[model samples]
Target: MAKWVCKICGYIYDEDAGDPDNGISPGTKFEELPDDWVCPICGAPKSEFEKLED
Candidate 1:
């Protein structure tokens, strides 16, 4: 599974470990996250996120 990063705050979202602070359980994929799910640190919307590179 590919990872994604938040462009607004540079927050990296690991598919193996979801954002626990935002009620996202581990192993949750980025695509599985709710549309309204915002960045826990910067409040950026999903649209502000992008696929990450190694």
Candidate 2:
């Protein structure tokens, strides 16, 4: 699994620990998130997120 960072608010999206509170199951990949999903903190679009180097 990989992790992604929201460029707008620096929110870290960990694939291994998905955002269950937002309906994203654990182990959910960042690429698999719904198209309408936005940053939980800053509401930034997916385009503003970037993959982090392992």
Cα lDDT of model 2 by residue, 1-54, tens digit: 898999888999999999999999999998899999999898999999999994
- In model 1, the Cα lDDT at residue 2 comes to 67
Off by over 4 Å in 1: none
Error of 1 at 7 (Å): 0.8
Question: How displaced is residue 2 in candidate 2, in Å?
Answer: 0.6
Question: Candidate 1, which ten residues in sequence have the lowest lDDT sum?
Answer: 13-22
For model 1, residues 1-54, the per-residue Cα lDDT tens digits are 668889988998888878887799998888899988988888998898899775
lDDT of 1: 0.87
TM-score of decoy 2: 0.93
Superposed by TM-score, candidate 1 places the C-alpha of residue 43 at a distance from the truth, in angstroms, of 0.3
List TM-score per model, in order.
0.85, 0.93
lDDT of 1 at 48: 88
List the candidate 2 regions with Cα displacement exceeding 4 Å.
none
CA lDDT scores, all candidates in order: 0.87, 0.93
